[PDB]
Each structure stands twice: as C-alpha cells, then as structure tokens.
Amino acid sequence: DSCIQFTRHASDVLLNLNRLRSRDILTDVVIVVSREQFRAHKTVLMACSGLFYSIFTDQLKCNLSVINLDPEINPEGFCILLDFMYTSRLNLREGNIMAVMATAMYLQMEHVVDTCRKFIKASE
Amino acid sequence: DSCIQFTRHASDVLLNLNRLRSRDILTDVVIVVSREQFRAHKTVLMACSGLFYSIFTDQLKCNLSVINLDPEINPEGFCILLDFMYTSRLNLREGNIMAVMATAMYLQMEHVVDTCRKFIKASE
Amino acid sequence: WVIP
Amino acid sequence: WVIP
Ligand SMILES: O=C1Cc2cc(Nc3nc(Cl)ncc3Br)ccc2N1
Ligand SMILES: O=C1Cc2cc(Nc3nc(Cl)ncc3Br)ccc2N1
Ligand SMILES: [Cl-]
Ligand SMILES: [Cl-]
C-alpha cells in the first residue's frame, strides 16, 4: 500500500495500556500465583504469552475472571514478566534469572526464554 | 533500573492485538458510524484516542457495548483510523485526507491531526 | 512519520 | 535486546 507509519505508535499504545494497568482500569482477569494476585487485561496477556493465548481462546476459559497458575510458579518471576509484557523492559538479575526463565518457559514467551538462556551461558 | 529491553516487543504486541481484531477475538464494543458497525477492543481504542479514553473511563459509559458516533463522522475516515490504531499505518490519500483529519480531530488523535495538517499545507 |  |  501507500500508507505512512508513525514510528512511536506501538510504544505509545503499550505505555497507555500500562497506565490503564497501574490505575486498574478495564482489567478483566486476576492471575493467581500461590498467595499473590495480579490484575491484568486478557488481550495484553494473550498478545505476550502462548499460554494465555491458548487459555483465553478456549470457549470455556475465555469467560473466567480468575486463572490459577501451576503452584511451582514463582510470584516474583511472574511479576517481572507481567511488567515486561506491559513495558518491553525485563528486570533480569543473577538472583532472579532461574525463576524468570522457568516462568517464561511455562508462559511460552520465546524471546524472554532466549535472552535468559544466553545470559546463563555467558556466566558458566 | 538495570532492565534490558526487547526492541520489537511493542510492535509484536500490536500485531497480535490486530490478529485478535481480525478474528473478532475478545472484542468488547461495537462503534456505530451511521449505517456501519466496527468491532474493537475498548483498551486499544482508549490507548489511541482521547475521545475513547474519556468515554470508557466514564462510570456509566464504561459498561456500554455499543457507542454511537456523531452523525457527521464519515465511516471510511473512521475505518482508516481504526486500522491505524491497530497497525501504526495510516492510509492517507488526496481523496480521504479531509474526512480522516475531521475524524482524527473528533477522536482526539493528535499525531494524525498533525500529519494531516502538514500534508494539506504542502498541497496549497 | 516515515515511509514503511 | 538492548540497554535502554
Ligand atoms: O512467545 C510467544 C508470544 C506469543 C503470543 C501469542 N499471541 C497471539 N498469537 C497469534 Cl498468532 N495471534 C494472536 C495472538 Br494474541 C501466541 C504465541 C506466543 N508465543
Ligand atoms: O492523541 C491522543 C491519543 C490519546 C490517548 C489517550 N489514552 C490514555 N492516556 C492516558 Cl494519559 N492514560 C491512559 C490512556 Br488509555 C489519551 C489522550 C490521547 N490523545
Ligand atoms: Cl517474549
Ligand atoms: Cl495519533
């Protein structure tokens, strides 16, 4: 086509989606990770995670307001990944890299899994 | 912070949101523009438009499944803008620039209004 | 704005 | 991935 493109549009959209998350506006699901709860937008979770995409395209699960993750999932690892989903920034640290990679594998977040594997390989 | 960033994340998120729109997955509102109807995600509309942000943060309007736009709004201009919201690409043409700018002013999409004013100024 |  |  003969379209023009606004370079910053996708980033500005994500920034606004994160502002809605921060103010709890139009969040439509709670993700339960053991004793912790995380409110989010189903569409954003689906756009970032193969696992949430599969869950919310399911004809029954699409209507659930609460999703319980596997008890092996670490709440901090999930929190770091949820922040990444809404900002493109990943808080990857020596103390959290194992929990973050395990959570990203479960959530099916391929690019996060890739950078975790590379950062681990560099330290061995 | 000491975060790393995935350059393409925001773009990939928007691409996935557009895939959900194309398959009518988790769309939660119909925008009526005269005889035409457009299905969309309230969060995406809010992230792109000052008008939709104001509408869906209203304690009553936030719960509406149908929003009727002003009858002066052109369905094609709205369609072009809805596509822009979900892709960052704007199909700006000599034949549609006036309808697109008028729709972007109503929807409060400042960057679109700016490029329309510049393209019009170049042709005068 | 750019030509994509 | 980059240093933002
Ligand atoms: O690593 C990742 C990230 C991700 C996101 C989605 N999400 C969607 N995929 C498609 Cl094709 N259409 C719409 C949506 Br929402 C699917 C798989 C994966 N794997
Ligand atoms: O030209 C534009 C585009 C746009 C988008 C929003 N959307 C939001 N703004 C804020 Cl501050 N927080 C969350 C959201 Br969603 C508000 C105003 C405008 N004007
Ligand atoms: Cl990822
Ligand atoms: Cl805009």
Order of helices and strands of chain A: EHEEHHEHEHH
Radius of gyration of chain A: 16 Å
Spatially, the strands of the biggest sheet of chain A line up as 3-2-4
Number of helices of chain A: 6
What is the 3D form of chain C? elongated
Percent in strands of chain C? under 5%
What level of helicity do the residues of chain A show? 40-55%
Largest interface, with Cβ-Cβ < 8 Å?
Answer: A-B, 40 and 40 residues
The first-level CATH class name of chain A: Alpha Beta
Organism (chains A, B): Homo sapiens (Human)
Subcellular location (chains A, B): Nucleus
Protein name (chains A, B): B-cell lymphoma 6 protein
Domain BTB (chains A, B): 27-94
Structural descriptors:
heterotetramer, A: 124 residues, alpha+beta, Potassium Channel Kv1.1, Chain A, 6 helices, 5 strands, globular, C: 4 residues, little secondary structure, binds the ligand O=C1Cc2cc(Nc3nc(Cl)ncc3Br)ccc2N1, binds chloride ion, B-cell lymphoma 6 protein (chains A, B), transcription, transcription factor
Can you describe what's shown?
Chains A, B: It comes from Homo sapiens. Chains A, B: It is found in: Nucleus. Chains A, B: This is B-cell lymphoma 6 protein. The complex is a heterotetramer, with two copies of chain A (124 residues) and two copies of chain C (4 residues). In chain A, β2 and β3 form a beta hairpin. Helix content of chain A is 53%, strand content 14%. Chain A starts with a strand and ends with a helix. Chain A has one domain: Potassium Channel Kv1.1, Chain A (2-Layer Sandwich), CATH 3.30.710.10. In chain A, α4 (75-87) crosses α5 and α5 (97-107) packs antiparallel against α6. In chain A, strands 3-2-4 form a three-stranded mixed β-sheet. Chain A is of the alpha+beta class and 124 residues long. The longest helix of chain A has 14 residues, at 9-22. Chain C is low in regular secondary structure. Chains in contact: A-B, A-C, A-D, B-C, B-D. Chains A and B meet through β1, α1, α2, β5 and α6 of A and β1, α1, α2, β5 and α6 of B. One ligand A1ACA sits between chains B (46-50, 53, 108-110) and A (16, 19-20).
